[PDB]
Amino acid sequence: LSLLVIGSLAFDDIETPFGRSDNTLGGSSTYIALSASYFTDEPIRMVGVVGSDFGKEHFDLLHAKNIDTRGIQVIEDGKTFRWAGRYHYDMNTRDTLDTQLNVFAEFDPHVPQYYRDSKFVCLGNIDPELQLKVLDQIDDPKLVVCDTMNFWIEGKPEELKKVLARVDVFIVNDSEARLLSGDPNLVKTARIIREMGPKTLIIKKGEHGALLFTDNGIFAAPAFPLESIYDPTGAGDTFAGGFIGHLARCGNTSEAEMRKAVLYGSAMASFCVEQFGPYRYNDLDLLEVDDRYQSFLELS
Amino acid sequence: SLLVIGSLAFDDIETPFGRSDNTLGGSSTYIALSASYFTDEPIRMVGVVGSDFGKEHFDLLHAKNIDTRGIQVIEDGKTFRWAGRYHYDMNTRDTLDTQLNVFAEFDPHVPQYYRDSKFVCLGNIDPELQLKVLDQIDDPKLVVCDTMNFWIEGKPEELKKVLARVDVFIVNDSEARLLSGDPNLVKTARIIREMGPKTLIIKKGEHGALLFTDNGIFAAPAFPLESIYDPTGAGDTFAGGFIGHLARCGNTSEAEMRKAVLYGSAMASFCVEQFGPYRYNDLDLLEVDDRYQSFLEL
Numbered sequence A: 001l002s003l004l005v006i007g008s009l010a011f012d013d014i015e016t017p018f019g020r021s022d023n024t025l026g027g028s029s030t031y032i033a034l035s036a037s038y039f040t041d042e043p044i045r046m047v048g049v050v051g052s053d054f055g056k057e058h059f060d061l062l063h064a065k066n067i068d069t070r071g072i073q074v075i076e077d078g079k080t081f082r083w084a085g086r087y088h089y090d091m092n093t094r095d096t097l098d099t100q101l102n103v104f105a106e107f108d109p110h111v112p113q114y115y116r117d118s119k120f121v122c123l124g125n126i127d128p129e130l131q132l133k134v135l136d137q138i139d140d141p142k143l144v145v146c147d148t149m150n151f152w153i154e155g156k157p158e159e160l161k162k163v164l165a166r167v168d169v170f171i172v173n174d175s176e177a178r179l180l181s182g183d184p185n186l187v188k189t190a191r192i193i194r195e196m197g198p199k200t201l202i203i204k205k206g207e208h209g210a211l212l213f214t215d216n217g218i219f220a221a222p223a224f225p226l227e228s229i230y231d232p233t234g235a236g237d238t239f240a241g242g243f244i245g246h247l248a249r250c251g252n253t254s255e256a257e258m259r260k261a262v263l264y265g266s267a268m269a270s271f272c273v274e275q276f277g278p279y280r281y282n283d284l285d286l287l288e289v290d291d292r293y294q295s296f297l298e299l300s
Numbered sequence B: 001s002l003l004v005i006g007s008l009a010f011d012d013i014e015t016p017f018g019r020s021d022n023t024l025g026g027s028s029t030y031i032a033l034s035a036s037y038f039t040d041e042p043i044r045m046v047g048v049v050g051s052d053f054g055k056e057h058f059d060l061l062h063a064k065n066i067d068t069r070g071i072q073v074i075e076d077g078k079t080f081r082w083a084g085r086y087h088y089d090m091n092t093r094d095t096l097d098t099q100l101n102v103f104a105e106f107d108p109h110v111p112q113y114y115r116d117s118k119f120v121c122l123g124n125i126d127p128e129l130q131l132k133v134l135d136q137i138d139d140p141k142l143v144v145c146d147t148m149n150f151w152i153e154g155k156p157e158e159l160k161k162v163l164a165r166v167d168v169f170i171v172n173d174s175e176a177r178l179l180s181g182d183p184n185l186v187k188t189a190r191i192i193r194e195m196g197p198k199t200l201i202i203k204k205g206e207h208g209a210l211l212f213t214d215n216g217i218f219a220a221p222a223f224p225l226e227s228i229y230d231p232t233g234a235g236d237t238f239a240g241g242f243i244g245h246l247a248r249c250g251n252t253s254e255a256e257m258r259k260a261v262l263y264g265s266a267m268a269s270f271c272v273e274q275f276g277p278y279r280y281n282d283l284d285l286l287e288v289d290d291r292y293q294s295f296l297e298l
């Protein structure tokens, strides 16, 4: 039930109408790994790259969740990926103010030999060409999950479609989905997107619920009524982490398991949004996670 | 991942303030219900009940995701029965009656699909039965066990056979002294550990617990103001919280065991609030987490 996580590792300058957090630890793989760690018994594997500015306090955070960082390269004198985002009163949508690929621009995604036998692969948000280069290095994956971002949907359409043709599960939010389909109807959008390759598609409408589209039909995961949203950053990636984490834990990829997996993902995302950055995970415990899952189950 | 054995029964419980007859009980029941609060996969149960063990009881276990395929049902038999009486100290008790019934000639059979269990809890029951079950587990990572004066006095030799093969042994202070023959709990711990158990936990009713290992003694203070109405099942719900937490995290280090002791104490403190295991009908995970935090701080 080994799990390998790929994605960005970065520092974010986050702004909402109520407050801000600069130089915040972030990146899609950070959120995915921290969330998934609540499901695996063995160390989560990470492949990525950071600069010399990536302090050891950040490495200690990951190691505290028993995350294996041997696959993370540190570029001497290089700079860590940076991102700036701004939210508004709807506390869901956001503007990307700045994006500096930095070390990820010239990244050579080498997956160490001891990671090539990974069974569950999560191709987190990052350049589709890198996502593909990593996938090509995994010998026999049981399940490939992937998510992207408007940046790549608009910047590298063709490359993205190449990766979409080789993934089992594609996770997107409703904005990205409509951008990819060119039609506002989510049902038609799902069809258009699934025809690009992904057998399973999950459309997460912010913290307003998630839709699971498979050959067996549609599953609507309810929203948590009074969720306290303070910072949406990382929500979609923590969702992906709980989703693949659950599947990696039970090792079964059936329909029923994917539905429960969506519920776990929603539960993890509901905790993520409670504070700036990934810090709600500092003290979040299993009893709390189990309790939140039950709420979502009951609502579904 | 977690397999539980022990008694399944109906208890006639009496205290100076009230009584509860034909109450669902048994060590297996208390351990399993408590442990379910910690595991995310069905707890496995091996045991036996009579034709008088109604659907309502199986439904209660099933409501907590407990797998009961390992429980046998004797169509012309009666479920294990016990009668106990508590006093004003609301801790010690007299066993007024014990009817092994179906557990008398019970040949424990662990179905094939339980054989790979990693965490095994040999709950209070005839030591001969506890051994027979353990002998059927392929390669367990941790074996926990508790007993009772009934067995300590009745089958000491058979019990000692079980103890030579368990990782963690859980007893209350009365059982501990009875086993050691000396009132000093520190000396008692050394004598009991010499019987085999590398880890010993002496739970003093609801007055705190002591964890003895090669690294020393850990004291889990008591919750000074807990509402005790029925102590029945306390020690077993303690064992359940203990092995349940470990089963879920998969780690059996000293550090996790001290935390597991705190979780067990939390579960026990809720169990005593009502007759039988019924406080668990409405108990939710956040209440448990809060109770745990209090024990942690103490």
Ligand SMILES: Nc1ncnc2c1ncn2[C@@H]1O[C@H](COP(=O)(O)O)[C@@H](O)[C@H]1O
Binding pocket: A007, A008, A009, A010, A011, A012, A025, A026, A027, A028, A031, A082, A083, A099, A125, A126, A127, A149, A151, A152, A232, A233, A234, A235, A236, A237, A238
């Ligand atoms: N182009 C990009 N590629 C990879 N990660 C990004 C990009 N832009 C922003 N991010 C990161 O993605 C995170 C938020 O993801 P999320 O809210 O789950 O969509 C932030 O912590 C950023 O570091």
Ligand SMILES: Nc1ncnc2c1ncn2[C@@H]1O[C@H](COP(=O)(O)O)[C@@H](O)[C@H]1O
Binding pocket: B006, B007, B008, B009, B010, B011, B024, B025, B026, B027, B030, B081, B082, B098, B124, B125, B126, B148, B150, B151, B231, B232, B233, B234, B235, B236, B237
């Ligand atoms: N000899 C025995 N073997 C197994 N279980 C017993 C025995 N005597 C009483 N019990 C059960 O153990 C429970 C209480 O355990 P406890 O207070 O945790 O020691 C009751 O619900 C009884 O059904």
